[PDB]
Write a protein that binds this ligand. Sequence first.
Ligand SMILES: Nc1ncnc2c1ncn2[C@@H]1O[C@H](CSCC[C@H](N)C(=O)O)[C@@H](O)[C@H]1O
Ligand SMILES: [Pt+2]
Lengths: 265, 265
Amino acid sequence: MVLYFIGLGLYDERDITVKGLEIAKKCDYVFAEFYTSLMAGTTLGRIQKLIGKEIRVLSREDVELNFENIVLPLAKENDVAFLTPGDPLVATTHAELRIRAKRAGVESYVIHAPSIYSAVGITGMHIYKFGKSATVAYPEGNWFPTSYYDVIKENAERGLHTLLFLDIKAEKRMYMTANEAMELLLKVEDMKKGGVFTDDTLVVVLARAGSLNPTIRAGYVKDLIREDFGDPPHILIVPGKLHIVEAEYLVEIAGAPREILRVNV
Amino acid sequence: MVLYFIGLGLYDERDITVKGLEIAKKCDYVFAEFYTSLMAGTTLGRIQKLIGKEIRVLSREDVELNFENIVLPLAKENDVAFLTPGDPLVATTHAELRIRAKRAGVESYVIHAPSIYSAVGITGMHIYKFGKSATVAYPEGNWFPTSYYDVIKENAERGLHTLLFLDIKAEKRMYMTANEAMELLLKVEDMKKGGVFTDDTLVVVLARAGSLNPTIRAGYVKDLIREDFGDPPHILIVPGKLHIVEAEYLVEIAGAPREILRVNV
Ligand SMILES: Nc1ncnc2c1ncn2[C@@H]1O[C@H](CSCC[C@H](N)C(=O)O)[C@@H](O)[C@H]1O
Ligand SMILES: [Pt+2]
């Protein structure tokens, strides 16, 4: 009778909320997609074992083109769950799927889970200070995306931090590293030359948030661009005006160069 | 020798993650604070019952002034948990607590949980479009704060949405309703005449995020200012120019007026 949007979490199958696990356990059919993000600490098998149901994994095309043909029909007679990495509506286009559910006479419910959007708090950067967010997309053929560069500029101008989601091509098993995002940004800097992202820019890297030992590093591009941050997923953050305690955290927890402790108010 | 920062979730006791619950159950001591926020859909008793551990509540002063003499000493020869509503480290001052842990020779680990920062995605507003966030505080004595008004202005000017936390007196359990927030903003608008918040401004109200039956309402200030959104806490959102898909979600899911499909897009 109902359809559930249930977040799975950041890292592994234990990042699902208790509410989500118990509701998922009682659903008749369980669907899921693993293309909007990467849960580096689990497998479909572990998820299925935790929920006690077999999970039918859908592709991007299944969802975007056939959600109402594959999932919605079963919801009219059964309770259906649709699992996704992180929080189901964050940094995805899944919100629109609720409009489809409604237009098909299906009631939907959303069970949240830890999202990378708030997990950025572990970097020590005050979350209220983040401005507009962006995605560093892979160039394809002659098309070279650059809008994310302007986002940084705009936020930096306002003294705000910038959260940069990194691209993912799940079908190819390609997960953009913070390294690759930095390479791409320098290339954009060379083109526009707005003094927005250079070798001297301070950046923060958060890798595998949700794991017990995520990689949290901060430093100048020239120094981190070739550093190994471990397995994906990675997210990149370009901080704006640092508060004293923000810089202190980065130095003490993220191993940032002691120098950044000296802010230029 | 270990301190765990564990998120409690959004609404009730089942909003904690499976990882957070299992880890907490294994801790020798469990602390919590409910000053940054409260879990309006549950009680300390039910949380305590779910964890199976006595939960020691800490006040704002216990944490901010005495964290190192109340919590850290025990973390030296035991596993200790520190529960907070939402996602750990989102509250501005919490990240600093990890620095105190390090200074005490104590290892700390973060276990995430849903935060309103990501949960607001249920409003249909694209997450990348949120700008700087702010808190609406009461005017008191000769003090009349208005910075949150300028935040809205700077965000909306760049087509960005503004997430607005409402004032709360946790200890006294006194919330600021979305209604009062609107009145304050209208009063601030009358003082600054910047044309930021008026009877014609479109707003979104989110209450009881995390529950299976949250209240999601969108409309113009003149129609919602005296509407009943239910029990606190309330979260106010002043969106920027809406995406056609964002406007459609508000209409189909949040009961927004058809008028926004042409006026705010
Ligand atoms: N655990 C994690 N650690 C680091 N980055 C992550 C992450 N999870 C997601 N990301 C970032 O976010 C991108 C996916 S966008 C989808 C985000 C998801 N809906 C959520 O709520 O978290 C990843 O490619 C990466 O750039
Ligand atoms: Pt969309």
